[PDB]
């Protein structure tokens, strides 16, 4: 069980750790988060009490190094940093733990929610979507735009999601216009799965990462990416059975975790209606269709 110590909490802030969140008061003696489960990516996220705009945060994996948070009063944010000195770090954490200045990652033993949202998400894939190769952790915020959004402006601070565009030469083989537009199987299976992602695991990992960025930061481009990757599968007549069964599980946990009050901004009516009721896969997402119909019947 790993720890992300905080130097201090000089500004009042709502701190997120994965799907959990805690309010910290200005200069409250908060020195971080302990008992973080090894084996998963995590995201530690922030919303300042005095400017609820710019949700921002850090994707990390405690297996890859010792990470801490320190407030930067110049840039005005909580920054993740790596401590390269193992013994200094162990000694910092031991002190804060002994003084019980740390919140415990509050996992219920029955609860597979975080595993189920991050099953295919791997830090190495995150670091290719979020390019800052001098750090082992990845910064995301509300306002970062996607490579796709930038085509339709600072490339350094972009989310390099795989560009999906149903009306592009990539998606449509010359002489198979109607066939490829009405049945995206070619695009999904040859271009995206065999060509770019290499396997369904990498494709699901990007889908899951896009959802989490949409949910935790209200990142609009992330939300567009999550919907596009769902719609590409649902609009394909030919999808491996294992992918459909896994997609149904993935979406079920995403819809289950979504705050009820954010459905109106995070769910695209057109995509969900098409996917559950008109698409080739309209009958292949039983779990997802049941939770959507019971939790968000308004949208449908």
């Amino acid at each position: 069980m790993n720890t992300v110590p905080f130097t201090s909490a000089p500004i009042e802030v709502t701190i997120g750790i994965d799907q959990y969140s805690f309010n910290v008061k200005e200069n409250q003696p908060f020195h971080g988060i302990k008992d973080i489960p090894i084996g998963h990516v995590h995201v530690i996220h922030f919303q300042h009490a005095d400017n609820s705009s710019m949700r921002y945060g850090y994707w990390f994996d405690c297996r890859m190094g010792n990470f801490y948070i320190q407030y930067d009063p110049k840039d005005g944010l909580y920054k993740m940093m790596e401590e390269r000195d193992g013994a200094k770090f162990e000694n910092i954490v031991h002190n804060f733990k002994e003084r019980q200045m740390m919140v415990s990652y509050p996992k219920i033993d029955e609860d597979d929610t975080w595993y189920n949202l991050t099953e295919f998400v791997q830090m190495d894939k995150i670091r290719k979507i979020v390019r800052k190769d001098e750090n082992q952790f990845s910064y995301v915020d509300s306002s970062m735009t996607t490579v796709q959004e930038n085509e339709l402006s600072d490339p350094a601070h972009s989310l390099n999601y795989t560009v999906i565009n149903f009306k592009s030469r990539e998606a449509i083989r010359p002489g198979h216009e109607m066939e490829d537009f009405l049945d995206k199987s070619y695009y999904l299976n040859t271009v995206m799965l065999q060509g770019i992602f290499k396997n369904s695991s990498n494709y699901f990992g990007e889908l899951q990462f896009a959802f989490l960025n949409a949910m935790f930061f209200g990142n609009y481009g992330s939300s567009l990416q999550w919907h596009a990757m769902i719609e590409l599968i649902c609009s394909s007549a030919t999808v491996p059975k294992h992918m459909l069964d896994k997609l149904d599980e993935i979406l079920y946990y995403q819809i289950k975790t979504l705050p009820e009050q954010y459905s109106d901004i995070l769910l695209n009516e057109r995509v969900w209606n098409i996917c559950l009721y008109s698409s080739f896969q309209k009958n292949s997402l039983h779990n997802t269709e049941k939770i959507m119909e019971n939790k968000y019947p308004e949208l449908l």
Partner: protein, 237 residues
Amino acid sequence: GAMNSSNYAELFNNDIKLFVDDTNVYRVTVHKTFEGNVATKAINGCIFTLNPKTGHLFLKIIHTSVWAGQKRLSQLAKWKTAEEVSALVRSLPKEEQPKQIIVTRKAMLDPLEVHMLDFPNIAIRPTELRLPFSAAMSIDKLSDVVMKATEPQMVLFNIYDDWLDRISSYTAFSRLTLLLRALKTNEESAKMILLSDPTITIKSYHLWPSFTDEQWITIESQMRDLILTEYGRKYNV
């Protein structure tokens, strides 16, 4: 975006554009079967592709053979239209290719957009205009070439005959839309108005009769009256 009354003069500027109307591509007669079920029999159709500036009409005849053993024909008809328009653009020299294609029905936008991905600089646009191009099959010589076709064929016409020698494109288009509107509202009466006087004939190389400027004014008035008469009937007003 969309072509309306606000940007009407744009039709007659010097940027090459084509209207595409797909309403006569897939044509059927509905009939009873021996067992008393209903069945369709396709008849020859046509894509109506018109340069509103020049009057140049690219009439692609759709032979019933293109439907043999195909499913969802009303959907296929949109994609076949888009394929044939894309093939027509690729057949034109670069300096003759349109800068815009306006589709008369919004259901043509995606099919044409996807067929024209190779031409990202050609704008595909809808129109708010209600254009009566469905009535093209009421022009006897266009109807005749479609019905007699035994194979796919492209036939080139000037839908304005020699009018542009005497009038502007704007006026020629307004005359054409009024003629087609009349033919669409009351075909019998419109054709009666156009042929009632046997001294005015249709030249072998023309679609419409050889009316003097004064006779066009009279014809145009009779067409307006026909549209108003018919409108007063439809609505009891």
